[PDB]
Amino acid sequence: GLIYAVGGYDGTGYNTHLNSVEAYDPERNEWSLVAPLSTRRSGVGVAVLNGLIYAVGGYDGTGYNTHLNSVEAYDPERNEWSLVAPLSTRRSGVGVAVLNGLIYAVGGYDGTGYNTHLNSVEAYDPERNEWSLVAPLSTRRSGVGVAVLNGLIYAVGGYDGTGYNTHLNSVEAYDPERNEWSLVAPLSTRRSGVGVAVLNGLIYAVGGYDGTGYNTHLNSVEAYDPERNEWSLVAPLSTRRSGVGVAVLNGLIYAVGGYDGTGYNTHLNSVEAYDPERNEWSLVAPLSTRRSGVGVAVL
């Protein structure tokens, strides 16, 4: 029952992309560092499946200077990472979610091979160690938030630096039974690097960067109600954060790290918890290391 913060980018302290990993214990309000990844990765997608944490893709701007297709799995019982089958396509800022026993890697940016933001989508089957491409998004999206609700995968916001050259407020839902994406109600604000989590039947979109309309890193937060196809703005964060990791644990939404390129001009180690019963954010123990583009999962 811990929050894991996987990789990221420290553009303030060490000026480096991170392979380090920390785990948060909410009962004691303590972060602690565990086994690091084999590869430094910012913009890394993180999902939990079969008791393992998967770190999918990312960007290594320190060691290899490349966008990554490699994938690693973390076993908390032995404190070991291990590399598994890589994606068909390199992807940073990739969204990851788990549905029906498969890991979906949604969109991202390939700044190494194809030099393009991606609408493609791949599913990983752990029983066979195989990735396979499925129906692509309607719109290319990097820095895209992804969450699963009511048997559907939602792709929230992102940045299309290839087709429309715009940060996106649009939202798509994937139906695995028919291999179809469909566009639904868009956000009030365009957001790339947006954190997405599901709590109490609602999708929360946390922070992000609006480089198109407001030209600002965001502290605002929106909740999506699928029964009515409506987004609504709720209590904002204490700090603006793009590339923020978001996870749900014990009824609270945790917003982990990120980048404030508007107010403080710094990468963040701070962490906030959202209480939906009171519509309140509150700051808790910060990470040992500042990190934006950080992957967050709960296990």
Q: How far is CA 150 from the centre of its chain?
A: 19
Binding-site member from 7, 11, 111, 207 for Ca ion (CB under 5 A): 111
In total, the chain counts a number of residues equal to: 299
Binding-site member from 25, 30, 125, 175 for Ca ion (CB under 5 A): 30
Per CB under 5 A, does 61 bind Ca ion?
Answer: no
Q: How far is the CB of 240 from Ca ion (least distance, A)?
A: 10
Terminal C-alpha separation, the chain: 5
Q: How far is the CB of 217 from Ca ion (least distance, A)?
A: 8
Which residues, numbered 152-191, are part of the site for Ca ion (CB under 5 A)? 161, 165, 180, 182
**Distance, CA of 284 to CA of 287 (rounded, Å):** 10
**Distance, CA of 179 to CA of 162 (rounded, Å):** 24
Binding-site member from 80, 125, 175, 225 for Ca ion (CB under 5 A): 80
Angle (CA) 283 289 294, round 5°: 80
Q: How far is the CB of 262 from Ca ion (least distance, A)?
A: 6
Per CB under 5 A, does 25 bind Ca ion?
Answer: no
Residue labelled with tokens 């933001």:
117
Per CB under 5 A, does 130 bind Ca ion?
Answer: yes
Binding-site member from 265, 275, 279, 283 for Ca ion (CB under 5 A): 265
- Adjacent-strand bridge partners of 108: 118
Per CB under 5 A, does 280 bind Ca ion?
Answer: yes
Residue labelled with tokens 């990097």:
142
Q: How far is the CB of 131 from Ca ion (least distance, A)?
A: 5
Nearest to 96 by CA among 140, 39, 156, 151: 156
Cβ-based nearer residue to Ca ion, 15 or 32: 32
Q: How far is the CB of 114 from Ca ion (least distance, A)?
A: 9
Nearest to 97 by CA among 18, 151, 37, 136: 151
Residue 119 backbone dihedrals phi, psi, to 5 degrees: -105, -5
Q: Which listed range, 18-26, 56-64, 168-176, 212-220, lies at the site for Ca ion (CB under 5 A)? A: 212-220
**Distance, CA of 4 to CA of 130 (rounded, Å):** 25
Cβ-based nearer residue to Ca ion, 13 or 80: 80
**Residue 107 exposed, middle or buried by CB count within 10 Å (0-12, 13-18, 19+):** buried
Tell me the site size for Ca ion, rule CB under 5 A. Answer: 20
Binding-site member from 245, 261, 293, 295 for Ca ion (CB under 5 A): 261
Provide the binding-site residues for Ca ion, judged by CB under 5 A. 30, 32, 80, 82, 111, 115, 130, 132, 161, 165, 180, 182, 211, 215, 230, 232, 261, 265, 280, 282
